[PDB]
């Protein structure tokens, strides 16, 4: 198919995976993590600032190539 029913059918997806440009419109942010965009979302792929509001909750982290090498 070319289709299912978009705007329905919930499932989770890990951050920093292959997000298709046909699934980057349905990235919907959860409220059990502080991380939501400061303003209304792009509707697209890219670097976006998500707000951390608790650093007493250390969450899983992916070092940049800078941090690893240094």
């Amino acid at each position: 198919f070319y289709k299912n029913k978009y705007s329905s059918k919930p499932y989770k997806v890990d951050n920093m995976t292959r997000i298709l440009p046909q699934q980057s419109r349905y990235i919907s942010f959860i409220k059990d993590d502080r991380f939501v965009p400061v303003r209304k979302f792009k509707g697209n792929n890219g670097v976006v600032v998500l707000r951390d509001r608790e650093p007493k909750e250390p969450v899983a982290l992916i070092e940049t190539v800078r941090q690893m090498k240094d």
Binding site: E63, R66, Q67, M68, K69, D70
Partner: protein, 127 residues
């Protein structure tokens, strides 16, 4: 033997501000065959650039509980290794390891785990 780049600090007894002045000297880690309680010889010599503090080639010894590691003593720059001999040959050193970068931030360098292994291993135990 194994060489790493090492820096000096600004030396004082006023409050021990111990700011890192990065220069471009070298430590030379020597593993010996004495003890197992910690006995290592850290040879600090400024290979190049002595500008920061008046120092001259020296090999300084490790006897426990006189040589102590303190994670922050600057209060904006970590990784302060401290030698205390009662201002006879007290010096402060901050390493410029390149296996964890030269970062001077609170909560050590960004690659933390290299620094945590190396520092405890040398104080407590010896080859």
């Amino acid at each position: 033997v194994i060489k790493f780049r090492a820096g000096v600090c600004e030396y004082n007894e006023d409050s021990r501000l111990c700011t890192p002045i990065p220069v471009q000297g070298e430590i030379e880690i020597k593993p010996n065959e004495e003890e197992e309680l910690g006995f290592w010889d850290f040879e600090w010599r400024p290979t190049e650039k002595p500008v920061g503090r008046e120092l001259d080639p020296i090999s300084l010894i490790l006897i426990p509980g006189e040589t102590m590691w303190v994670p922050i003593k600057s209060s904006k720059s970590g990784r302060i290794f401290a030698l205390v001999f009662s201002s006879n040959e007290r010096y402060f050193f901050w390493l410029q390891e390149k296996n964890s970068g030269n970062l001077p931030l609170n909560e050590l360098s960004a690659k933390d785990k290299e620094i945590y292994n190396k520092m405890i291993g040398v104080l407590n135990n010896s080859s």
